[PDB]
């Protein structure tokens, strides 16, 4: 009770992981904002179809990496290189 | 919307490097080629239009939608001194 953080575990699917993103310190989605977002949970992809990550969730973390005030590049990296089970922590 | 950058390539080359295409995609399977380093003091950084991860259209009028990467790193190489880069972000 009175957590913004969530622990989700997405279960890659033979399509990947269906979510798209956009921020950074190299990318800023909004002004002097550096937070990692989710743009789109993408239809027929693994995020959908578990159905609990939402559009504009900010990424805390991927598996044991945290994504606060890093460069886009490092998310990517981290959610590219996935295994089979891939542990996001959100924020709302 | 897209924009058109026009670039001298400088002593460096253009001063950008890409990644993606059909044959690397994106990991939510985007195929899109995308500028991933922009280097600092390079022909595209001293330009002042581009950005990193801004996404690559088309090079001196050839389209670049669903291409394989060697395709867009050809067509960058062969582009000469100066080459026309199509871009939307």
Do not use: W
């Amino acid at each position: 009770l009175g957590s913004q953080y969530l622990d989700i575990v997405l279960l890659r699917g033979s399509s990947g992981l269906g979510f798209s993103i956009a921020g950074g310190t190299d990318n800023p989605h909004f002004d002097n904002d550096t937070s990692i977002y989710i743009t789109k949970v993408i239809p027929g992809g693994a995020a959908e179809a578990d159905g609990r990550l939402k559009v504009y969730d900010t990424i805390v973390a991927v598996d044991d990496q945290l994504m606060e005030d890093v460069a886009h590049q490092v998310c990517v990296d981290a959610l590219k290189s996935a295994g089979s089970e891939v542990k996001l922590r959100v924020k709302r």
